[PDB]
Design a protein around this motif. Sequence first.
Motif, short mmCIF file in Angstrom:
data_model
loop_
_atom_site.label_atom_id
_atom_site.label_comp_id
_atom_site.label_asym_id
_atom_site.label_seq_id
_atom_site.Cartn_x
_atom_site.Cartn_y
_atom_site.Cartn_z
N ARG A 176 0.71 -0.97 0.09
CA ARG A 176 0.15 0.06 0.20
C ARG A 176 0.97 1.69 -0.29
NH1 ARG A 176 -5.30 0.02 1.22
NH2 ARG A 176 -5.17 2.31 2.33
N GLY A 177 1.96 1.40 0.70
CA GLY A 177 2.39 2.09 0.51
C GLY A 177 3.77 2.86 -0.09
N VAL A 178 3.90 1.93 -0.94
CA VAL A 178 4.31 1.45 -2.36
C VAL A 178 4.03 2.23 -3.88
CG1 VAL A 178 5.72 0.92 -4.40
CG2 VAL A 178 6.62 0.14 -1.53
N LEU A 179 2.70 1.43 -3.71
CA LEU A 179 1.24 2.31 -4.50
C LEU A 179 1.27 2.68 -4.29
CD1 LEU A 179 -0.01 -1.72 -5.23
CD2 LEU A 179 1.66 -0.27 -6.35
N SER A 180 1.03 4.09 -3.39
CA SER A 180 0.71 4.91 -2.64
C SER A 180 1.01 6.29 -3.69
CB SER A 180 0.64 5.49 -1.35
OG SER A 180 0.59 4.14 -0.58
N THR A 181 2.20 6.70 -4.11
CA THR A 181 2.27 7.25 -5.52
C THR A 181 2.28 6.44 -6.61
OG1 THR A 181 4.40 8.48 -6.72
CG2 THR A 181 4.87 6.32 -5.54
N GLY A 182 1.82 8.21 -7.72
CA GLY A 182 1.33 7.42 -8.97
C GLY A 182 2.08 6.80 -9.63
N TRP A 224 2.59 3.87 -13.09
CA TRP A 224 2.00 3.07 -15.03
C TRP A 224 0.87 2.67 -14.99
CZ3 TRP A 224 5.11 -0.40 -13.48
CH2 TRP A 224 5.59 -1.65 -14.61
N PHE A 225 0.46 2.02 -13.43
CA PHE A 225 -0.67 1.55 -13.79
C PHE A 225 -1.47 2.69 -12.40
CE2 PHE A 225 0.73 -1.18 -9.74
CZ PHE A 225 1.95 -1.34 -10.46
N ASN A 226 -2.49 2.82 -12.62
CA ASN A 226 -3.03 4.06 -12.64
C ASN A 226 -5.04 4.54 -12.93
OD1 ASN A 226 -1.58 5.56 -13.56
ND2 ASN A 226 -1.95 7.46 -12.14
N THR A 227 -5.45 4.88 -12.28
CA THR A 227 -6.93 4.77 -13.35
C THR A 227 -6.99 6.27 -13.66
OG1 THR A 227 -8.73 4.75 -11.44
CG2 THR A 227 -8.22 2.74 -13.14
N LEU A 254 -6.22 4.75 -3.33
CA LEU A 254 -5.17 4.90 -2.31
C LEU A 254 -5.17 6.63 -2.66
CD1 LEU A 254 -2.85 2.04 -2.87
CD2 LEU A 254 -4.24 3.00 -0.59
N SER A 255 -4.41 7.46 -3.16
CA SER A 255 -4.40 8.52 -3.66
C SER A 255 -5.26 9.57 -5.64
CB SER A 255 -3.00 8.86 -3.65
OG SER A 255 -2.19 8.79 -2.03
N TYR A 305 -5.68 13.14 -7.14
CA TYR A 305 -5.39 14.33 -7.40
C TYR A 305 -6.54 15.07 -8.68
CZ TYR A 305 -0.94 12.67 -5.94
OH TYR A 305 0.21 11.49 -4.84
N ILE A 339 -5.43 3.90 -7.51
CA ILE A 339 -5.54 2.74 -6.85
C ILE A 339 -4.50 1.76 -6.81
CG2 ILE A 339 -7.52 3.01 -8.60
CD1 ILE A 339 -7.38 0.85 -10.08
#
Lengths: 132, 145, 52, 181, 181, 181, 181
Positions: E40-46, E48-51, E72-73, E75, E109
């Motif tokens: 979760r912490g690593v994937l929190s930042t954007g 290349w696989f984010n919707t 997760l975050s 913007y 996500i």
Amino acid sequence: YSWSEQTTLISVDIEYLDKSYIYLYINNVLISNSDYSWNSDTLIQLNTTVLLVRRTDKEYLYIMFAEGAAFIRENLDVQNTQFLHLAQELVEGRSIDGFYGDLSMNGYRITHLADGVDPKDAVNKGQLDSVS
Amino acid sequence: SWSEQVVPSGTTLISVDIEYLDKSYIYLYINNVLISNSDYSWNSDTLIQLNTPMASAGTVLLVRRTDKEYLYIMFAEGAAFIRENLDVQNTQFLHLAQELVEGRSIDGFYGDLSMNGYRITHLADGVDPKDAVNKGQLDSVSNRV
Amino acid sequence: AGDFARLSVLSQALTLYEVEAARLYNAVSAGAGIDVDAAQAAETGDYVQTSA
Amino acid sequence: RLTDAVNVTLEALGESRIVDINTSNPSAGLARAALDRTRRGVLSTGWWFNTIIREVTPTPNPGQIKVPWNQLSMYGLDGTKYGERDGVLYNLVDQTKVFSDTVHLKVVIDIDFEDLPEHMAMWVANATAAQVYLNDLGADGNYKSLLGIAAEYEAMNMREHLRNQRYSTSRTHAARKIRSG
Amino acid sequence: RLTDAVNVTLEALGESRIVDINTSNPSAGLARAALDRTRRGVLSTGWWFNTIIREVTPTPNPGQIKVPWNQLSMYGLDGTKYGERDGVLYNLVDQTKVFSDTVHLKVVIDIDFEDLPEHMAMWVANATAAQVYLNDLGADGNYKSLLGIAAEYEAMNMREHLRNQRYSTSRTHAARKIRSG
Amino acid sequence: RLTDAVNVTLEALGESRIVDINTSNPSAGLARAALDRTRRGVLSTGWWFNTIIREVTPTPNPGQIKVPWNQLSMYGLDGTKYGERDGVLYNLVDQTKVFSDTVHLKVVIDIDFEDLPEHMAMWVANATAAQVYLNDLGADGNYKSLLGIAAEYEAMNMREHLRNQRYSTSRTHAARKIRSG
Amino acid sequence: RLTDAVNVTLEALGESRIVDINTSNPSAGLARAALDRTRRGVLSTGWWFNTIIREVTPTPNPGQIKVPWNQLSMYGLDGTKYGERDGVLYNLVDQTKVFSDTVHLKVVIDIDFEDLPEHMAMWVANATAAQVYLNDLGADGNYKSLLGIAAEYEAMNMREHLRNQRYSTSRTHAARKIRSG
């Protein structure tokens, strides 16, 4: 069974899963939890009518199980108590704040209606008879 | 538990965000009209494609209704009592409580309701003699008299 | 022809390098401790606290 | 060859070598599992014997594409990002599994430990042995020596990859060379 | 794949790896908890696989806008701060939950540990193993070696992310290219 | 999420994870209290999901103003300094509690641990775990590793804050840009 | 909030934190004494919350001028040295307690530990904890870490102080601005 209605110390007789689940109302006004502290599990002391409403969150499970974690018998009881309490406030009528469909109550009348002022509100016959 | 939005005319892809337990638990409404399951298909887990594009812009509603027929996980007939089984079994009840709280699942009351001195606000105008009425239609009666 | 082609390639590379040089942005180091919320305004020469 | 790699891993620890792979030795299966993990981790980046450029069209009327091969990484030649959900193609940014037109992509397949070049196999075996020694007997001079051997074999593998893939100045020099002709 | 990472963490501790899924006596649950937290912490930042939610026009009657559950975050594409409150969109600077116009927001996500690229999965597993080792067996050379391995896998993940998103110079050079034509 | 943070703190010490928050474990309440203290200390500085610009007018004839929200810090947009005495607004330099005109101010509200971004929550949880480990088992390599993890999550939170708040050169360039138009 | 800081100091010593206010057997009184001493020492210097006595014209019959009881330091706006003696204003250079004209002085007052900004309160609490740890458990890495935490909180306090008092260049540039208009 889920809400209590009754000058510095307030008792809490209704059960709950968390302290933050209890909302305190003074004259139908909400008070933030930063304005009072919990002396005990059955005593609330204010900083300076009284209504207590419980509202368990329904977004997360209260007890989350993890592989390789310590387990006791009371964990299942608390997990079931979460749903039991949720159904309790569902029954008491202080949880549902509106409807999104057409009610189809068959041949039953609704009692104790406050007189509406906005013409979109419902009206009782205490005003219909006066008009008539 | 549900989502409503206004989509432009000619849209076939509908994206869902409701965390469902089964694909059959998601109901699609177009302009407050239920859409049969044969009129749309699931391209993926979070994407609904309509067989025929919408002719005109309308509201899309994605009510979820958990199937409260039987327990999702029956422990006496083979469940192993492991983490995910208990998680799913409790998730069923949590979801059901969610839709019950949202208030889109109750259709009627078989008893005498008691508002206890609280107004039933935002009540639409009646159309049938058995329907309730609001203060808006009482204004016409006040004016005529 | 070859000299013209070499000149065209060099000119395109020069254009790309000029585009790269025209890029301007300020990098902020969290460990430095600079008050970015007050350093961003500045302009008129304010007193911004920093831990450097 | 796989038995030889497992024997190298066992030699690094100092245990007894095996002559029959797929045996009941507790440390034999551990070596195979570590070798497989290291191989999958290291072949994820594109090499000359992993990257193949293929184009797959949705077989039915526009729908899902079942991804073939034993893919490790999946880059998209076009401007879309691809994934692999439930064994079929998946658009990571679009969150969709149905495609309308044919897709061109570069896929990094997985290679079994019996059919990969000698230098790459030696690098994988020595890296696995170094990792196992570090996890078992701790970090010491033996760990550093094993890491050095693994790095030398990594350099050999890089030399092989660079030799078989001619990477010269042939990107923009084509424009400056075809004009002189 | 999740059992593979749990076995990675177990090997880092020197214990015998397991095969059965989440039915083990030894304290391997800490490995799973650390793996989930690190993922979760690593994937929190954007990445290349984010919707993206290009446009969500709210209905005027409720006024609230639903957001993905596994987010997760978030913007805002425009100049607005956004967040989650009770599973719906929230205005941080306005402290309100209702919206009257469309919102263009970029949302990150969360991804299950069996559904993410190999490099990122290996990085998460090695970071979890390093954290568990630091918690249990102390900070010795093994912890430093595990940290180095995790850093190498993070570098490979960054390479993959840069490969999938072509971050060339195509922002201000577009004006020059248009001027040339 | 809060239970996960407490479990992370307990894992750092090496104790047994909890599955029921608000239990009777002596170290469970300690973790929650440390998390709350760290959260209140770290959110005092303005972030994108904490700062809201509001203006409040004295409701009666010029008198006191009861400060709403769960304020942490309270800056004044005008040239006056504001405090919070007995739950009402207070002028720090003037030593008065009654205001005549409306006041414009930027207030930094407090955010519960269940409704804040993922990166910020991870940073808070790891900082709390590092502090608890330092206080309990002393300063050693584990403390430095936990501090490094907390710093990485701090960098991620800073990246999120900078991304959602567009901080470009738009302060004096407006004068040099509107004139060209 | 005072009990929270006492618990901070207790945690720094590794002891179990208390809940009841000042009714504890363990020597937590040293924490309170150190907290009070540190708060007075830190607030001795002028901060953004300090009062001013713009004009106090003395009555000719007594001749003495009263000063605030909770004062810490006093600076005359004009060129006069001032101090406290028996609760009234005192002339250091003249060694007299009587005054015949008005006095413009800047005075720094003391603030209760439940009535000061969060950053300054955290700095005071951490400094008190560090001092108590140095007195009791010696000077080890824990003391250095506590000192670093206190320094970070002091930096945040300085940031807040600089935010509240806009210390731009508006002293000699006023002449240039007036000349330009």
